[PDB]
Amino acid sequence: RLTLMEEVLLLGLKDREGYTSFWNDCISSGLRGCMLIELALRGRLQLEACGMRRKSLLTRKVICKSDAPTGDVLLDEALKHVKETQPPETVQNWIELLSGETWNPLKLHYQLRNVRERLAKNLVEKGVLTTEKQNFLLFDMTTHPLTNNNIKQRLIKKVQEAVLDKWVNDPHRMDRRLLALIYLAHASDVLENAFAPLLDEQYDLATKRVRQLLDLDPEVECLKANTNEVLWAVVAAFT
């Protein structure tokens, strides 16, 4: 069982050793989106609903509806902040707060540090990576190669299939965890990795279908009964 952070991250891992995979500003923002979506789906957060009469997803405030620990150390750091911080803040503000995109001393202690290490630790715990302490000729570093090749391949197929053979014209008919996964992977720019192994024709098709999913309107779409509003807020924030 993988968190959306872990699935985004894995999508961005190209070889085994990961020496041609790179961190950057899209994905570290990407991952903070993933965390709010994770917290939402688990009934930890909701959007305020009191004046929505006039307000957008982008302007509505995030409410901690439960502070129950989840057993993911980052999910818990993030939730613990969304519990003390008050008054409440909007989705974009959280994504910023949590990635340290402030110059205000008061907001600094909100930023989540060592995201890469902690995720990689998580994946070692789950048996997806290992540890190779290494002594290179020019520096020491400790790496985490991919050992569990099946789960990676399963993940890639999962994403591939959702916009190909399993595709259905209707988005809410499809598992939310997977829809949010597509949006974030794109926002984090690792999605394109799921598609490069594809044949030309599938490649275009998938792409058409994704772009179509990007053309949806979260304001329209967060109205279907039984969806997560925070999810579409997070989609709004990265569109």
3-state secondary structure the chain: CCCHHHHHHHHCCCCCCCCCCCCCHHHHHHHHHHHHHHHHHCCCEEECCCCCCCCCCCCCEEEECCCCCCCCHHHHHHHHHHHHCCCCCEHHHHHHHHHCCCCCHHHHCCCCCCHHHHHHHHHHHCCCECCEEEEECCEEEEECCECCHHHHHHHHHHHHHHCCCCCCCCHHHCCHHHHHHHHHHHHHCCCHHHHCCCCHHHHHHHHHHHHHHHHCCHHHHCCCCCCCHHHHHHHHHCC
Q: Which of 139, 203, 156, 147 lies closest to 18, judged by CA?
A: 147
Query: Using CB atoms within 10 A of its CB, is residue 42 exposed (0-12), middle (13-18) or buried (19+)?
Result: middle
Residues after which the chain is broken (C–N above 2.5 A) are none
Q: Cα–Cα distance between 1 and 35 in angstroms, integer?
A: 15
Q: Cα–Cα distance between 122 and 127 in angstroms, integer?
A: 9
Q: Give me the resolution in angstroms, 1 decimal.
A: 2.9
Query: Using CB atoms within 10 A of its CB, is residue 201 exposed (0-12), middle (13-18) or buried (19+)?
Result: exposed
Other CB atoms within a 10 A radius of the CB of residue 29 amount to: 20
What experiment produced this structure? X-ray
Q: Is 113 annotated as a binding residue?
A: yes
Q: Cα–Cα distance between 239 and 235 in angstroms, integer?
A: 6
Please name the residues in contact with 103: beta carbons below 8 A apart, sequence gap of 6 or more. Answer: none
CB 79 within 8 A of CB 39: yes
Q: Is 176 annotated as a binding residue?
A: no
Query: Residues 150, 152, 154, CA angle at the centre, nearest 5°?
Result: 65
Q: Is 103 annotated as a binding residue?
A: no
Q: Cα–Cα distance between 143 and 120 in angstroms, integer?
A: 9
Give residue 155's region: left, alpha or beta (phi > 0; psi -120 to 50).
alpha
Task: Report residue 57 CA to chain centroid gap.
Answer: 18
Q: Is 32 annotated as a binding residue?
A: yes
Query: Residues 77, 149, 162, CA angle at the centre, nearest 5°?
Result: 75
Per-position b or e across 47-70, b if 16+ CB within 10 A of its CB = beeeeeeeeebebbbbbbeeeeeb
Annotated domain spans of the chain: 1-239
Q: Which CATH architecture has domain 1-239?
A: Orthogonal Bundle (1.10)
